[PDB]
Amino acid sequence: MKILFVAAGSPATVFALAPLATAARNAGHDVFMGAVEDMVPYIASAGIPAVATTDLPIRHFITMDREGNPVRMPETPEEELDFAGHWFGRMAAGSMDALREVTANWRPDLVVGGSMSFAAALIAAELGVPYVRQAWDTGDAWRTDPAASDELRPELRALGLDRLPDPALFVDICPPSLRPADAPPAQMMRWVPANGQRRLEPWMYTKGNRPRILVTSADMAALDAEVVIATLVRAGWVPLDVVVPTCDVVVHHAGGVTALTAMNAGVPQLIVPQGGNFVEAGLRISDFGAAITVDENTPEAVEKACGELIGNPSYAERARELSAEIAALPLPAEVVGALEGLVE
Amino acid sequence: MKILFVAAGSPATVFALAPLATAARNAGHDVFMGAVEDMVPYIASAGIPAVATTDLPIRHFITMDREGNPVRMPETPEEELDFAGHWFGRMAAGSMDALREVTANWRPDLVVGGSMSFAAALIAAELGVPYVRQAWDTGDAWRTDPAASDELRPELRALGLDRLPDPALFVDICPPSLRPADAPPAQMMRWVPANGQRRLEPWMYTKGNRPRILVTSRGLVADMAALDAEVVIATLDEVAEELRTELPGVRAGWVPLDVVVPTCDVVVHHAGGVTALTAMNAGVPQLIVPQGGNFVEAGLRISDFGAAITVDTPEAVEKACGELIGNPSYAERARELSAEIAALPLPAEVVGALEGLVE
Ligand SMILES: [Mg+2]
Ligand SMILES: [Mg+2]
């Protein structure tokens, strides 16, 4: 069958969907993935045929309303949820022209969207084909829905709907221990780490004598550890999937799929705020005991936390528990059958 | 487990192995793929972690022996088989230092090589882990082995072997109807078309009413474009700008075969690599050309089956094209081959065979 995957505005939204997309391709399905123009190279880097859904970047939808007037960044966790619902809603509305033109020439039998790829729900409803929602991180997929519903009121009304439609299938990659008490039924799936590739250097897969700390996007100068900085004491391009398993600490902001890659490898995490706000997903990992949550702008806080994550085995113990949970989940190749069941 | 894939010197050798490698990765295995430096970006383009097995290009192994002496180019299919055995052998010998170094730090539990990735057999024997040979096209995987076993006699001797070892498993992607009478037993696998990707443009996945003929990497464009069919020319990026300005109004340049082939009525190629499989998979008739007069056997078998024409010149390509479009037989035979391919075990299932070899 033809399956259209719909990612969003950032590389993690592409890679969240890559394992299922590639599994579907490997089962003989014809698979396209769409995202904003800036993300098309990221889709291509996963080896998946790539289409653009808008020629505007995520910043355009984040920083301005539909009329082009500037909108401020959110300041609280509650504002975060609401503001994100709106920007993802704007991006979705802005994606419809290109999705219509693509699907007029290559008509999918099934549409798969990430957590807040709301254009996937809309185009699926327009075509009358089933819509699958895949969680693109361990955060609650539905958490921005009320605001997104309000943003998309006009588009939803044109389809005869009062709110965002329920998916035909919800596919969840969150380990059971981290799923909220109010989580809906889901087809579970093991997310297998994936990211773009270049050429591996020996250090990427060979750990030295000292503890290895990966920072994704001075402190650490007294730890006597090997620090690797993953950018655009070694710096530069770092394939997370290959390098994370060699690490003892991963330092990130719980945006994207980095937390999942760390948990999958049983590696303790140090989680800093994203903007001025800790991400809810990251707090739940911290609560479980597989990470430490820390404000970087307190001097020595990061240094102290790294020391704790390296010297106290319990964090790694909890990380390996999460790793075990992930490994027990249905494979992407298995989940392809659930997709097939929706159209036959 | 850790699985090392070993491709070779051309993009098809990478893409031939990509479906099983990505399926193994998707099953939770740690997967690396090695090839010559020039092919590393092609491995990367498949989304697979990539290591270089040698910094030397394929031309070095083809044109000179290990001692720097020039090698005489083959003039016949028979000479070609011995010639390829020796040059793939030299490429394999030149790959061992890097493979030794990689596997000292990241030790695989299993090694999978393409048809003539002989360094895969050598490194697996040295490590004492199972070796899987996967056919990388519909041609006979073993057909250069005698010359390859001569080329690698010293490396093989050091491992206590008199010739190239039998793989622990042979995985074959050749449709049953095209397998020769003497084909060895295999685990069959459905090959799924894969290649590098870049932004799709609408023409790539839109078929028109007018027949579409794909040429893989002038008088033909003028001829064929009068008036029945359009021609799409797949090229490398070095010559894409040159050919566009030499042939205005023609789709020429980067072409993703997996996306474009299903829209075509004919695929025109020389039967190297995985193009024949991509055409057959989509049920598309093929026009096969020779490089001088060095007919690829795999292509002759597809023509013998009736899903392709092998034609020897500017005017005669036009003729075979009219035939492959006009006579419905050719597409009928191609769809039969497509059906045979769809019935073969999925890469996701074949991963279970790899797992069974270690446990
Ligand atoms: Mg104002
Ligand atoms: Mg000899």
DSSP notation for B137-206: SSS-TTTTHHHHHHHTHHHHHTTT-SSPPPPSEEEE-S-GGGS-TTPPP-EE-------------GGGG-
What count of Cα atoms within 13 Å lies in the side-chain half-sphere of residue A55?
0
Residue B22 Cα, gap to closest chain A Cα (Å): 7
Q: In which order are the strands placed within the sheet that holds B169-172?
A: B50-52, B30-35, B2-6, B110-114, B131-134, B169-172, B187-188
B105 to chain A: closest CA residue: A206
Residue A85 forms contact with B (CB below 8 Å): no
The token pair at A127 is 């075509």
Question: Taking a C-beta distance cutoff of 8 angstroms, is the pair A7, A176 a contact?
Answer: no
Resolution for this experimental structure (Å): 1.9
Separation CA A143–CA B317 (nearest Å): 60
What count of Cα atoms within 13 Å lies in the side-chain half-sphere of residue B161?
17
Residues 6+ apart with CB under 8 A from A318: A268, A288, A289, A290
Pair (A259, A341) in one structural domain: no
Pair (A248, A124) in one structural domain: no
Instruction: Evaluate whether residue B205 is within a structural domain.
Output: yes
Q: Which residues pair with B251 in a beta bridge?
A: B232
The token pair at B337 is 């081959």
Q: For residue A246, what are the CA distances in angstroms to A235, A336, B228?
A: 16, 30, 59
Q: Tell me, what CATH number does A47's domain have?
A: 3.40.50.2000
Tell which residue, A304, A218, A320, has the closest CA to residue A268. Answer: A320
Tell which residue, B186, B99, B279, B49, has the closest CA to residue A244. Answer: B49
Partner residue opposite B347 with nearest CB, options A26, A197, A245? A26
Q: Which of 94-133 (A) contact B at CB < 8 A?
A: 101-102, 105-106
The token pair at B135 is 């056919």
Match 């990612």 to its residue by tokens.
A7
Separation CA B330–CA B324 (nearest Å): 6
Q: Which helix (H) or strand (E) holds B213?
A: strand B212-215
Match 């904003």 to its residue by tokens.
A36
A40 to chain B: closest CA residue: B199
Residues 6+ apart with CB under 8 A from B41: A198, A199, B50
Q: Is B270 annotated as a binding residue?
A: yes
Range of the structural domain that residue B62 is part of: 1-189+344-359
Torsion sign (Cα): B164, B166, B172, B177 = positive
| Residue B222: CB atoms within 10 Å | 12
Separation CA A339–CA A29 (nearest Å): 11
Separation CA B224–CA B302 (nearest Å): 24
Pair (B207, B282) in one structural domain: yes
Please judge whether B43 and A332 are an interchain contact, meaning their C-beta atoms are less than 8 angstroms apart. Answer: no
Question: Which ligand does the CA of B156 lie closest to?
Answer: 2
Partner residue opposite B19 with nearest CB, options A26, A242, A245? A26
Instruction: Evaluate whether residue A322 is within a structural domain.
Output: yes
Q: Which of 160-179 (A) contact B at CB < 8 A?
A: none
Question: Taking a C-beta distance cutoff of 8 angstroms, is the pair A129, A85 a contact?
Answer: no
Pair (B299, B357) in one structural domain: no
Residues 6+ apart with CB under 8 A from A88: A8, A61, A116, A117, A118, A144, A148, A151
Please judge whether A190 and B105 are an interchain contact, meaning their C-beta atoms are less than 8 angstroms apart. Answer: no
- Residues in A touching B18 (Cβ below 8 Å): 47
Q: Which residues pair with B44 in a beta bridge?
A: none
Question: Taking a C-beta distance cutoff of 8 angstroms, is the pair A321, A296 a contact?
Answer: no
Q: Which residues pair with A70 in a beta bridge?
A: A64
Instruction: Evaluate whether residue B194 is within a structural domain.
Output: no
Q: Based on C-alpha coordinates, what's the Rg of chain A?
A: 20
Pair (A139, A287) in one structural domain: no
Separation CA A99–CA A95 (nearest Å): 6
Q: How far is the CA of B87 from the centre of ligand 2 (A)?
A: 11
Please, which experimental method was used?
X-ray
Pair (A304, A336) in one structural domain: no
Separation CA B339–CA A52 (nearest Å): 32
Residue B71 Cα, gap to closest chain A Cα (Å): 31
Pair (A172, A226) in one structural domain: no
Partner residue opposite B348 with nearest CB, options A50, A106, A333? A333
Query: Is beta strand B187-188 parallel, antiparallel or unpaired with respect to A249-252?
Result: unpaired
Question: Taking a C-beta distance cutoff of 8 angstroms, is the pair B17, B192 a contact?
Answer: no
The token pair at B72 is 């005489």
The token pair at A155 is 């588009």
- Burial (CB count <10 Å: 0-12, 13-18, 19+), residue B355: middle
Separation CA A197–CA B144 (nearest Å): 32
Question: Taking a C-beta distance cutoff of 8 angstroms, is the pair B13, B114 a contact?
Answer: yes
Please judge whether B262 and A30 are an interchain contact, meaning their C-beta atoms are less than 8 angstroms apart. Answer: yes
Q: Which of 45-64 (B) contact A at CB < 8 A?
A: 45-52
Question: Taking a C-beta distance cutoff of 8 angstroms, is the pair A234, A203 a contact?
Answer: yes
Q: What separation, in Å, do the N-terminal and C-terminal C-alpha atoms of chain A show?
A: 10
Question: Which ligand does the CA of A64 lie closest to?
Answer: 1
Separation CA A244–CA A207 (nearest Å): 11
Q: For residue A80, what are the CA distances in angstroms to A74, A75, A88, A292?
A: 5, 7, 12, 22
Secondary structure class of A221 (helix, strand, coil): coil
Question: Taking a C-beta distance cutoff of 8 angstroms, is the pair B214, B268 a contact?
Answer: yes
Tell which residue, B196, B47, B200, has the closest CA to residue A51. Answer: B200
What letter represents residue B111's amino acid?
A: V
The token pair at A335 is 């989940």
Residues 6+ apart with CB under 8 A from A12: A136, A137, A255, A256, A257, A258
Please judge whether A205 and B106 are an interchain contact, meaning their C-beta atoms are less than 8 angstroms apart. Answer: yes
Separation CA A113–CA B210 (nearest Å): 35
Q: Based on C-alpha coordinates, what's the Rg of chain B?
A: 20
Residue B149 Cα, gap to closest chain A Cα (Å): 31
Secondary structure class of B221 (helix, strand, coil): helix
Residues 6+ apart with CB under 8 A from A161: A125
Tell which residue, A116, A38, A133, has the closest CA to residue A81. Answer: A116
Q: What is the count of residue pairs from A and B with beta carbons less than 8 Å apart?
A: 121
The token pair at B48 is 């697979």
Instruction: Evaluate whether residue A195 is within a structural domain.
Output: no
Q: Which residues pair with A52 in a beta bridge?
A: A35
Q: State the total domains in chain A.
A: 2
Separation CA A183–CA A9 (nearest Å): 25
Q: Which helix (H) or strand (E) holds A286?
A: helix A280-288
Largest CA distance in chain A: 62
Residue B205 Cα, gap to closest chain A Cα (Å): 7
Residue A338 forms contact with B (CB below 8 Å): no
Residue A198 Cα, gap to closest chain B Cα (Å): 5
Q: Which helix (H) or strand (E) holds A302?
A: helix A301-311
Residue A57 Cα, gap to closest chain B Cα (Å): 16
Secondary structure class of B32 (helix, strand, coil): strand
Pair (B236, B322) in one structural domain: yes
Instruction: Evaluate whether residue A217 is within a structural domain.
Output: yes
Q: How far is the CA of A68 from the centre of ligand 1 (A)?
A: 12
Q: How far is CA B223 from the centre of its chain?
A: 30
Q: How far is CA B56 from the centre of its chain?
A: 20
Pair (A110, A210) in one structural domain: no
Q: Which residues pair with A6 in a beta bridge?
A: A34, A113
Match 């780490």 to its residue by tokens.
A193
Pair (A246, A312) in one structural domain: yes
Q: For residue A51, what are the CA distances in angstroms to A39, A54, A99, A336?
A: 9, 9, 9, 22
Q: How far is the CA of B93 from the centre of ligand 2 (A)?
A: 12
Please judge whether A28 and B202 are an interchain contact, meaning their C-beta atoms are less than 8 angstroms apart. Answer: no
Q: Is B136 annotated as a binding residue?
A: no
Partner residue opposite A46 with nearest CB, options B47, B101, B200? B47
Instruction: Evaluate whether residue A194 is within a structural domain.
Output: no
User: Where are the strands (E) in chain A, listed by range?
Assistant: 2-6, 30-35, 50-52, 110-114, 131-134, 169-172, 187-188, 212-216, 226-230, 234-236, 249-252, 269-271, 291-293
Say what the alpha-carbon torsion angle A264, A266, A270, A271 is, to the nearest 10 degrees: 30
Pair (A88, A123) in one structural domain: yes
Instruction: Evaluate whether residue B195 is within a structural domain.
Output: no
Q: Which helix (H) or strand (E) holds A156?
A: helix A153-158
Partner residue opposite B49 with nearest CB, options A28, A51, A200? A200
Residues 6+ apart with CB under 8 A from B189: B19, B20, B134, B171, B172, B173, B344, B345, B346, B347, B350
Say what the alpha-carbon torsion angle B155, B157, B162, B165 is, to the nearest 10 degrees: -50
- Burial (CB count <10 Å: 0-12, 13-18, 19+), residue A198: middle
The token pair at A323 is 């790793």
Tell which residue, B339, B335, B195, B194, has the closest CA to residue B265. Answer: B335
Query: B27 φ, ψ to 5°?
Result: -90, -5
Partner residue opposite B197 with nearest CB, options A47, A241, A327? A47
Q: Which helix (H) or strand (E) holds B133?
A: strand B131-134
Please judge whether A27 and B346 are an interchain contact, meaning their C-beta atoms are less than 8 angstroms apart. Answer: yes
Largest CA distance in chain B: 63
What letter represents residue A10's amino acid?
A: S
Pair (A85, A207) in one structural domain: no
Separation CA A200–CA A202 (nearest Å): 7
Q: What separation, in Å, do the N-terminal and C-terminal C-alpha atoms of chain B show?
A: 10
Instruction: Evaluate whether residue B324 is within a structural domain.
Output: yes
